[PDB]
Amino acid sequence: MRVNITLACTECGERNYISKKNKRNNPDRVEFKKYCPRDKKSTLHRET
Amino acid sequence: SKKGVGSTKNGRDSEAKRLGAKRADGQFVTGGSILYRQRGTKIYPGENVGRGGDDTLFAKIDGTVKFERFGRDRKKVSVYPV
Amino acid sequence: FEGGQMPLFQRLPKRGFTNINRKEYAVVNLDKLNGFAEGTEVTPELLLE
Amino acid sequence: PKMKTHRGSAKRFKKTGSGKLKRSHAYTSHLFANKSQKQKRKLRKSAVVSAGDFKRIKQMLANI
RNA sequence: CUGGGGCGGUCGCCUCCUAAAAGGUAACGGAGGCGCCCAAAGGUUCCCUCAGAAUGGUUGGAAAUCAUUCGCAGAGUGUAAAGGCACAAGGGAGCUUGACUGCGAGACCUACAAGUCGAGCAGGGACGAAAGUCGGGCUUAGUGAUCCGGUGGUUCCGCAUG
RNA sequence: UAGGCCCAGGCGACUGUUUAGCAAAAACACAGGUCUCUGCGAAGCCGUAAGGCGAAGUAUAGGGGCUGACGCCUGCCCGGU
RNA sequence: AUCCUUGGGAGUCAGACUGCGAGUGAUAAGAUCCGUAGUCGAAAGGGAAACAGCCCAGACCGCCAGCUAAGGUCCCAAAGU
RNA sequence: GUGGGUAGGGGUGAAAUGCCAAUCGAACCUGGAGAUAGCUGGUUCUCUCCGAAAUAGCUUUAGGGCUAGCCUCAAGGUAAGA
RNA sequence: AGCAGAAGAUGCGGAGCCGCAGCGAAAGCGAGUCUGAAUAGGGCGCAUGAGUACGUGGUCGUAGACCCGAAACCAGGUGAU
RNA sequence: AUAGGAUAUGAGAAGGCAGACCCGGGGAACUGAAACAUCUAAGUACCCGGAGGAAGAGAAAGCAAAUGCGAUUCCCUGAGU
């Protein structure tokens, strides 16, 4: 179920990453926070 | 004559990944050069040596390289400058 | 060639491209302009000849 | 008849100022899940053609 | 590939042994495995230490649990061998997302293509009082060139000019 | 100069034909048996087509396939193709 | 007295045998496949009777010069019954 | 016997891969054609200076090749080299 | 190249080429330029300055490319005396 | 009325060959790509129709982006870009 899906930005709408996550174990629209260089700060990154 | 009987079940082998003392006891050594490749910590780091992601030994500030002993049977890499 | 191993110009990527127009404003080194002693009027027509 | 440029090498190579040609690395745009970014931050540079295989294609792209 | 070939079997990756006390070092030699898994089985703060054995007990049983000594490790360390680990890298909490952008002096290995380690700098963090650690899992497997199409972004080019 | 016979077997009905230049045979042919297609500007043919075979033929005739006189027969499965 | 870089220029990417250490093999093979060392290959001369790999030793060329190594010193055949 | 047709990825065959001018799993001639050959044979006068390897990574690859490996020529560096 | 020139040098022709400076894909910038938020780092280059034209030889690219040799392929003709 | 038939007139044209060069219609393969089928080889050879000493093309629906050039052809650059 392990699918590699990018984690796009919310401040700018910009993909920027790849993360491993599970379709069963994490079924939500998962969200971490990382560093967008075009937004220069810590940024809410939901799954897309 | 001949009958055809096999087979061997055991032919495979990995790529030989290297270890051993890359420098000697008494080497001038530049910053960040690998002293000793390891699977684990077969020898621990001491003065001015870090530890890699492969738990490897590499010298930060230059100078001589001395292999030592903890006590009783346990070695230790430290780097002493000029 | 590489024997049959896929050779080095194929294991390496393209880097496009070349311009439809690229202009090369070339060349004047600055110490070329000590060819005038004393001199003025530095034009390419006075530099072509 | 002249020496043809082997064009397909010359799309991949940049002749520097003597030179020591340039190239971009392999493994560089096909698949990016498995390759970690510490590998990728060293592949997104350019690179200089190694001395062994520079012997075999100085005959090739001498017309630049 | 081959002890002629065919049939059988193998083609690549990690570990051990053969390997001759650096490091490599062959055969259709001897063993295992690998095309993953963990949103935490990651990072950090702070705790704690095993397995088995005996003694006695609740249906209790050769053994689930519970108490007192033993117990340097005979336990675990995702998965399998070698090394390593209790000051923990082993178990348990809390707060979290560094499983980080731009790098990278310098090294290791080597035909090349590759691959590996990185001190240190800046950007912003996380945990921590600080000291400080953090560029994923104790390490070593779990992955594949180029071309070709697609998706997001592009103070790039655009075939007389827009 | 003009046949050696006579029993008993396997194959093939037979006379014939073939590997010119190794193999005449138990091979092939064969009449007979069938299954099938074709209504005639035809079925199949050779043709890029025109033309022609089939044929101054007409389903008791042509083309294709299978098997091979004669006698007794030709059992079962339409799942697959 | 070699090494490092740099460039021009090629050959070989099937090796054998002997000893020492190994595997396969039956602790078989002038067997196969590795390390190490030699020689051959690319090395003539003397030994080992003849002998590519053992033992000794390196052929610029002439001498009707001398001294030695491996091996020898009754005849073959040089040198001690 | 005469006279005469059926022409080569075709003819013809009471079928064997037979026959088609002494040639048949595709007739002979002329050309593309100096087809290609990782394969074999051959590589013509002399002397000197040095003098290899049969190992590896790969490889539709094992009796081919390409980088290394060892050789040679020249120039720098200098005493690194053992 | 061409124009005069015994098909010859030679003359004249600047049309063009190489070099004089690079850096990025590129807009472009320039003893620097890229990557870079970066007057951080690093890659290529500068300080350190030789090219160019002809001639000789080692080579190599394209042609039969070092000689001799396939079996087969293709086009177009002659041959059932 | 036509098809057609008869007649005379045509210094009409069928054939050839300079094995070449030039248009047009057809038009392969072998070789390479280290295999091969896209490609190349190659619109090459070969066949066929045209003629002329030459043929073909040609006076703009052309280049090209300025202060523009003015029919085609050929050569050299442009550029193995």
Experimental technique of record:
cryo-EM
Alpha carbon D36 to chain centroid, angstroms: 22
C8 vs D: CB within 8 A: yes
Chains D and C touch (3+ CB pairs under 8 A): yes
C3 vs D: CB within 8 A: no
Among chain D residues, the shortest Cα distance to C11 is held by D26
D33 vs A: CB within 8 A: yes
Q: Integer distance in angstroms from CA B18 to C1' E16?
A: 15
Give A4's strand partners.
Answer: A20
Please name the residue whose C-alpha is nearest to the C1' of nucleotide E145. Answer: C11
Long-range contacts of D39-45 (CB under 8 A, 24+ apart): none
Of C12, C14, C16, the CB nearest to D26: C12
CA geometry: angle at A14 spanning A47 and D29, to 5°? 95
D44 vs C: CB within 8 A: no
Strands D46-48 and D22-24: antiparallel
Give B69's strand partners.
Answer: B75
Q: Integer distance in angstroms from CA B4 to C1' F63?
A: 55
Q: CB of residue D52 closer than 7 A to nucleic acid strand H?
A: yes
Q: Measured between beta carbons, which residues in chain C are less than 8 angstroms from residue D57? A: 8-9
Residue A22 φ/ψ, nearest 5 degrees? -105, 140
For residue B79, the SS3 value is: strand
Of D6, D14, D29, the CB nearest to C13: D29
Stated in angstroms to one decimal place, the resolution of this structure is 3.8
Helix then strand then coil, in percent of chain C rounded to 5, is 20, 5, 75
Q: Measured between beta carbons, which residues in chain A are less than 8 angstroms from residue D33? A: 4, 18, 20
D21 vs C: CB within 8 A: no
What is the residue type of B38?
A: Q
Residue D47: which of C1, B33, C5, C12 has the closest Cα?
C12
* Rounded-to-integer distance, Cα B21 and Cα D20, Å: 34
**CA D32, D37, D38, D42 torsion-angle sign:** positive
In angstroms, what CA-CA distances link B30 with B20, B33, D63? Answer: 18, 6, 42
